Amino acid sequence: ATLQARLGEMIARLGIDVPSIIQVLDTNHTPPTFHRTNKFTAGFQSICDC
Amino acid sequence: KEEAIFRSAEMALVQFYIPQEISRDSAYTLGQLGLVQFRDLNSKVRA
Amino acid sequence: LTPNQVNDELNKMQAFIRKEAEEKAKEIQLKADQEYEIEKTNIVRNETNNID
Amino acid sequence: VPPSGSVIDDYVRNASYLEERLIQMEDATDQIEVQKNDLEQYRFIL
Amino acid sequence: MGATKILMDSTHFNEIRSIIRSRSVAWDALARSEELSEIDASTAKALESIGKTLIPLIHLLSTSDNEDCKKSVQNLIAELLSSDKYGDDTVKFFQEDPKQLEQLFDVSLKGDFQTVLISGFNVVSLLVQNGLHNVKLVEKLLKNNNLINILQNIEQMDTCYVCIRLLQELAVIPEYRDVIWLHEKKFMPTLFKILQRAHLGIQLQYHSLLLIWLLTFNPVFANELVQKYLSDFLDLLKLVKITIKEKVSRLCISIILQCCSTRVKQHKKVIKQLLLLGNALPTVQSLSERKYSDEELRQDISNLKEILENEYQELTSFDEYVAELDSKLLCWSPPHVDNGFWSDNIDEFKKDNYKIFRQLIELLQAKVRNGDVNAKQEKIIIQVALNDITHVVELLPESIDVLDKTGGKADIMELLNHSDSRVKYEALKATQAIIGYTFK
């Protein structure tokens, strides 16, 4: 939602009249793994995932 | 209202319907978010 | 949000494709009419020179 | 953010202009360095 | 119907039509108020719904002048004309009896600022249909003060589009083009101003450029466009450079190419050279380096680049350099790179005992002895002369003696302290070339 909002805000800023759309695929392929670690625990997470 | 380090975050594969003309601005900003990768596509041919 | 997303995607596709293609085709047709008139003058000029 | 746009092509042309100008400048500088080095011994003569 | 002429109905051009339709009143008491005839009341009742009826409509619009019934009638007529449910018959209502078209134009050119565009939509729709051209009506519309002022009100872009797009749609007719240009001396500058500033904003830019491009299809008017308003014609290249939408860039490139075409013999090459003297060639090269996703636009860019390259023969013409020498002021044209691109002219410059070198030295001495180093034209002339002299002297060191005898050896050294950064840098380059060549 937030990336769509940012893209729409830019499109309005860019003056592109044609709207921008995005849809979610059927994720058959394995997506990557993410961890929204802060500076409090980024070191621990990185050392663990080494 | 966002994920945490409890496990791997909820992944997603969304489809970019980028207009051809505005493509450079869209790519620039989308990279500015520091939030998205790009799935390896059309890599079957030489560089 | 899916019907809203579907409607937004349809509107975006319409604006990007149908209107743009119609405008480009109209411009191409107008420029083609102008070019046809210009080339007609060249043929008209050559045939008028032959007639003279 | 202030995205560049055609300022990208402006930067490209600017960089090419800078190389041509400063390459000419560096050629001038080392050529005249050779010139003054040659005359410095020549001036010290006689 | 012959055409729709919707022009996407952006913003006010459809919002006002909807709002007027929203405020619809049957006007049943208006006939009881004697403002509208019984046939007029029947027209209102039928128009309340979202052939022969086109007569009482105009009869009411003319006879009844409350201007509110007039606004309602204009909205209803425009909706009926646009509505494809009976739009064929609506267009036939002028394609069958075009006599009342002049009366309609007498009705269309009326009303307030909001209603003026509403009427003008129908006026253009009837005018643009293939069944009737009516050049006199087009001229009369071009002579209306209200619509002209509205099209001049670029401050309210949402309304100015309803005018510019209307004119451009009306300009599609080849017959109306001649009268369009005749009164275009009070319309084009606003369109040039609109393009100068740069969905309504982009659509205004695209539609406005279309009117200029469509009018420019005639070379006779194209010469006048290139001459009278050469500033906007030159700035079109920059506008294409900064445009984001591919359609705008394609239109600008097509307009430039059409202006610089083999037609318009008054400036068929003069205008092309004029652009190339307005910093056009590097921009054309950069556009060639681009990857615009349009085969027509790419072909147009390639053709423009080829035309500019062919016009670059002005450099290889040593006669052109001689003519510039005859001119008291030289311009930073490709002739200023004639020696580097074609060293052959060095022999001609050397000939007649440094004839061209003496001429250039005389030009530089005249510029310096009169000062005015801060003058933009004088600074440009001095810089061009200094660069040419540096190219010539480095191409033949024997000319150093001629320059010294002329006093230019110390003159350029004095000019090394010129106020202008470009002038000072060019003088430094020339002196380094002369000092470096003489040091051998």
UniProtKB/Swiss-Prot annotation, chain B:
PTM field: Glycosylated.
Superkingdom of the source species: Eukaryota
Compartment list: Vacuole membrane
Summary of the function given for this chain in its UniProt record: Subunit of the V0 complex of vacuolar(H+)-ATPase (V-ATPase), a multisubunit enzyme composed of a peripheral complex (V1) that hydrolyzes ATP and a membrane integral complex (V0) that translocates protons. V-ATPase is responsible for acidifying and maintaining the pH of intracellular compartments. Is present only in vacuolar V-ATPase complexes; enzymes containing this subunit have a 4-fold higher ratio of proton transport to ATP hydrolysis than complexes containing the Golgi/endosomal isoform and undergo reversible dissociation of V1 and V0 in response to glucose depletion.
Subunit structure of this chain's protein: V-ATPase is a heteromultimeric enzyme composed of a peripheral catalytic V1 complex (components A to H) attached to an integral membrane V0 proton pore complex (components: a, c, c', c'', d, e, f and VOA1).
Similarity annotation: Belongs to the V-ATPase 116 kDa subunit family.
More info: Present with 55714 molecules/cell in log phase SD medium.
Record protein name field: V-type proton ATPase subunit a, vacuolar isoform
Organism of derivation: Saccharomyces cerevisiae (strain ATCC 204508 / S288c)
Curated annotation (Swiss-Prot), chain D:
Residue ranges of coiled coil: 18-46
UniProt modification remark: Glycosylated.
Cellular compartment(s): Vacuole membrane
Protein purpose: Subunit of the V0 complex of vacuolar(H+)-ATPase (V-ATPase), a multisubunit enzyme composed of a peripheral complex (V1) that hydrolyzes ATP and a membrane integral complex (V0) that translocates protons. V-ATPase is responsible for acidifying and maintaining the pH of intracellular compartments. Is present only in vacuolar V-ATPase complexes; enzymes containing this subunit have a 4-fold higher ratio of proton transport to ATP hydrolysis than complexes containing the Golgi/endosomal isoform and undergo reversible dissociation of V1 and V0 in response to glucose depletion.
Oligomeric form and interacting partners: V-ATPase is a heteromultimeric enzyme composed of a peripheral catalytic V1 complex (components A to H) attached to an integral membrane V0 proton pore complex (components: a, c, c', c'', d, e, f and VOA1).
Record-stated family: Belongs to the V-ATPase 116 kDa subunit family.
Note: Present with 55714 molecules/cell in log phase SD medium.
Protein name in the entry: V-type proton ATPase subunit a, vacuolar isoform
Source organism: Saccharomyces cerevisiae (strain ATCC 204508 / S288c) (Baker's yeast)
Swiss-Prot record, chain E:
Coiled coil: none
Keywords tagged on the record: Hydrogen ion transport, Ion transport, Membrane, Transport, Vacuole
Phenotype upon gene inactivation: Increases the ATPase activity of membrane-detached V-ATPase V1. Abolishes growth at pH 7.5 and in the presence of calcium chloride, abrogates growth at pH 5.0.
GO CC list: fungal-type vacuole membrane; Golgi membrane; proton-transporting V-type ATPase complex; vacuolar proton-transporting V-type ATPase complex; vacuolar proton-transporting V-type ATPase, V1 domain
Pfam families on file: V-ATPase_H_C, V-ATPase_H_N
Keyword DNA damage on entry: no
Domain of life: Eukaryota
GO biological process: endosomal lumen acidification; Golgi lumen acidification; proton transmembrane transport; vacuolar acidification
Principal location listed in the UniProt entry: membrane
Leftover remarks: Present with 22500 molecules/cell in log phase SD medium.
Described purpose of this protein according to its UniProt entry: Subunit of the V1 complex of vacuolar(H+)-ATPase (V-ATPase), a multisubunit enzyme composed of a peripheral complex (V1) that hydrolyzes ATP and a membrane integral complex (V0) that translocates protons. V-ATPase is responsible for acidifying and maintaining the pH of intracellular compartments. This subunit is essential for activity, but not assembly, of the enzyme complex. This subunit is also required for silencing the ATPase activity of V-ATPase when V1 is detached from V0.
Subunit-level organization: V-ATPase is a heteromultimeric enzyme composed of a peripheral catalytic V1 complex (components A to H) attached to an integral membrane V0 proton pore complex (components: a, c, c', c'', d, e, f and VOA1). Interacts with YND1.
Name of the protein described by the UniProt record: V-type proton ATPase subunit H
Naturally occurring in which organism (per UniProt): Saccharomyces cerevisiae (strain ATCC 204508 / S288c) (Baker's yeast)
